[PDB]
Amino acid sequence: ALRNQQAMAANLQARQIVLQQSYPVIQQVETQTFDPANRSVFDVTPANVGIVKGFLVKVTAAITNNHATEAVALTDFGPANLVQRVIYYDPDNQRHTETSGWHLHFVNTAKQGAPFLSSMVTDSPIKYGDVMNVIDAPATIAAGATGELTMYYWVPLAYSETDLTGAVLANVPQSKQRLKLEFANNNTAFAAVGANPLEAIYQGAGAADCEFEEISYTVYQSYLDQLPVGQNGYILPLIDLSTLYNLENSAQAGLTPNVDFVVQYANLYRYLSTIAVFDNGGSFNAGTDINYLSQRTANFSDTRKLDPKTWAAQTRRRIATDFPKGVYYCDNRDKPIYTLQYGNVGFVVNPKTVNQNARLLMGYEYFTSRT
Amino acid sequence: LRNQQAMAANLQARQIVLQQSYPVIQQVETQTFDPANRSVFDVTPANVGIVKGFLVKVTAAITNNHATEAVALTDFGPANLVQRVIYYDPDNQRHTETSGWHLHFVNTAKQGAPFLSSMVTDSPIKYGDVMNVIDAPATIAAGATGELTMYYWVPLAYSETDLTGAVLANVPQSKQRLKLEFANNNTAFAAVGANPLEAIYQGAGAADCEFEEISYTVYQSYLDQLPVGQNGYILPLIDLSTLYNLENSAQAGLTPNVDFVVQYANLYRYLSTIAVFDNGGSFNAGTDINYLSQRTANFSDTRKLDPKTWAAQTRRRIATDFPKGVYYCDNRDKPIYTLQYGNVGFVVNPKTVNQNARLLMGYEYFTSRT
Amino acid sequence: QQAALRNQQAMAANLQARQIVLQQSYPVIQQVETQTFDPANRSVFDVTPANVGIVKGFLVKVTAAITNNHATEAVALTDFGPANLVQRVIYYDPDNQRHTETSGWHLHFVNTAKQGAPFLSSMVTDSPIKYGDVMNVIDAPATIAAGATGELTMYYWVPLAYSETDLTGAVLANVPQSKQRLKLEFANNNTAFAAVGANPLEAIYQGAGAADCEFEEISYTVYQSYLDQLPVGQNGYILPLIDLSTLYNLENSAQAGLTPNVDFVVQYANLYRYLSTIAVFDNGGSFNAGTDINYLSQRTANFSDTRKLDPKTWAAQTRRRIATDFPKGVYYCDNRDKPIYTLQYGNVGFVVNPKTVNQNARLLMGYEYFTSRT
Ligand SMILES: [Cl-]
Ligand SMILES: [Cl-]
Ligand code: NA
Ligand code: NA
Ligand code: NA
Ligand code: NA
Ligand code: NA
Ligand code: NA
Ligand code: NA
């Protein structure tokens, strides 16, 4: 136990020194403009330099609705669905995050404490506001019109700007990293009336005649350069750099009215946050199809069994607003769910109404060691 | 000497408790009723671990049975769904005893923004007021029924990380008492021209408004699995021997252009002060006040400010203004504390004073159990 | 050789004394002066603050009534609007040393940057309880119609100390001999109103009725924030000597010579530790939302850019700092945790590579920095 306490102390000190001595850099890695009808999957090759903290991905797109008369309107996720999936592999080909664009975006929001890169509305007479359209998409695209969209995603390796847990040391000249981006295409972006809008950007009677004109992306890599050297070479937080900080998502089915649907935290990961999306057969409701949600331990005791509005209240304290309809969030950052500290734990949803093809899309944020 | 070590130990124990125990939020009671029959309830919380506070959810349906006239929300609106709250701990010592609106304003001051609100942004992703956590229709038309939702946090512990004021109830045995007095058909509706201070809706149809029903659910927040050491449970004795209370009072006797001073009592460490200028039923946006201040006898004013400048300081604390006639003062970093009664006072020099004018004061403070 | 231990010890002593001062003294905010005037008669004032204890800064309240006397045309707020009620502010301490010397718009943008949101603004929420813009702390009508009179209110915080907890830059004002001086150069009928097609940079309103707009009056009230009842010890008053011997200043400048697709570089001077940088691209009177820029960057002598970004990505970083965008053509850069200091690395420069350059284009730079009094 002394070897550990000292190991953690050494790690923190090394982290603190790296942060004080190195200088942060953010620089463009690659940009590409394309038509997803031609290609929608791209493998970006990050530069191998210093300690890598994450990637900021700018995505723009132009969409045209050529329907003769009908419009389409943004889905609840909208531009967050411009990227369908993101997967990162480090120089040792160890996979870190692999999740959907919508889940990654919701975590970006949770970590910011407000809708990611949004512009807050105030009474200021000075002309602050949505000036630069950092994340933007027209509410509707009428028949015959073309809309322009902009979206940003932060793909994290390091947990934060000050906590390097999960960061990647990329100083091995011949071992490349891989950032795979799978973009939306005409098939995923447009949903007909009555179809499931989960993965779509726009939905409406004009959907069949909507097409992307183009999508463009620019990946910026954030890293620390001029790493401090000491009496043993680079001073590095060994625990930070051998821990993976990942996001992943999965789908669970088998819900029945008034019965507890339990999703066990199946791995021995340290779960920092959990997102549960109740895709009630293509319908996304504002809590009205749920009796309660909870986190429960094998001891059968609930640590937070709450009605939907009260559950939402806790989230409002975290992001200053509510996540979209049917999206529920749970913060476990200070005391991560770890099944080896207490019995197995489960995330619980007791549904009031269950439509055909109902399912819970689970999104997790967690730490785990490489070994 | 000493103390340095007493506080050092208290803080160490607090840290161990926060690190080792596990937080739980649990429903302890729910009830639906008709205020025509009853509006005062005494909730019995569970005696388990260290209790931090209670989240009280209140929902109500209001029917405007008037034939042709509507009513509209007052400035406090749903914050008046609970008229008063009183908490007694296992040792029969009272902590908070205040109005629902004062409790709500403190919840907002502590959050740094309107309590449990949804902030509006340009995000195209559909975040927003999706769940209507705190909600009430702006107006209820003649013949219509409106649905309202309100939440209040009754604190024992000062915060999630500062357990000062928390209550140990894992042992006490004796019961705790959380008393709640709800709005009723006599307090919720104000006629045009009547004082709207304690009401939820005001308007020409008020006389014919009534509650269809009210429901409440109390959730208790506490720490379980308390850490044990040599001498036994590791506990922050100072935290648990200190009361963190909210209290209200009313003062009258205001006259144009004369300093109206409300004295702070001794012994209490006042963290915040709220003063509501109920100018005879009229609530104005500072236009009826010359200035407000906090003053020490023989040391003058530490912050004598015009109303807008006073409001500017508040905008730095809650990112907006409190409702008309509601003034806030933050003294958290250096609490008002006098060894002599009234060695410090809160001042309001009114420009205009209507009949039946008064200041409704609200205080947040720390004080020793002994 | 070494002996640098002195610095280490000096820093510790400075921090200890700062803490003692913060713990023992009591904060006071007090009105020092209020005046109502007609800008046609005068617009420059020199305020003499009180010499009491350690001065942290000044909160300046400014109100105005503007009438648009045009027979038919209206005027509308410029992007800066009421932030241009004060054109320039300059502070001198008792030793007659200059601290902040900048434009009202720059001071206001820094007030916003340090708050983490539009300065003293009222956010909008779904709360049914009537919070909101109740007190109109900073306010100005979006337009003033022909024949109408509009009322404005704006506030500026002129900092001496860096913050309420970091007294770096604060001023000890106890010498009865020499007075401090806070100079305010206000807007007047020649700066506040821009005709259609004229440069709106320094104006409050712009539009077809501008030539007939006039101030009815402007009023200001200066409140001084300071620490009184300073703690004493064996060696007398306990005081953070480094904090009180360091200047925390805001200054602005102007540079021209931009050409399409060529890097325009503005060098940071040596000795100053730059906490933030603001660059306003006054493209010949046109202020655009990034569309006239290829990219912006901060660069060191080594061709090494630490953040060469396209305008929207640059704007994204700013949204993380103030929760919204600064007005069109206004770009912000936060270097608070690692201040730009040309001694730490080679010379450093702020870069703008413009896509389009109109005649009379220029970059207006605003800086926040720390520097030794000596
Ligand atoms: Cl009943
Ligand atoms: Cl005059
Ligand atoms: Na192809
Ligand atoms: Na609502
Ligand atoms: Na009645
Ligand atoms: Na009372
Ligand atoms: Na306003
Ligand atoms: Na003029
Ligand atoms: Na200068």
Curated annotation (Swiss-Prot), chain C:
Locations listed in the record: Virion
Source species, domain of life: Viruses
Protein name: Major capsid protein P3
Subunit structure: Homotrimer.
Keyword Lyase appears in the UniProt entry: no
Function: Major capsid protein self-assembles to form an icosahedral capsid with a pseudo T=25 symmetry, about 66 nm in diameter, and consisting of 240 capsid proteins trimers. The capsid encapsulates an inner membrane and the genomic dsDNA genome. The major coat protein P3 and two assembly factors (P10 and P17) are needed during the assembly of the virus particle inside the host cell, when the capsid protein multimers are capable of enclosing the host-derived membrane, containing the virus-encoded membrane-associated proteins.
Keywords per UniProt: Capsid protein, Virion
GO CC annotation, single: viral capsid
Organism: Enterobacteria phage PRD1
Disulphide linkage map: none
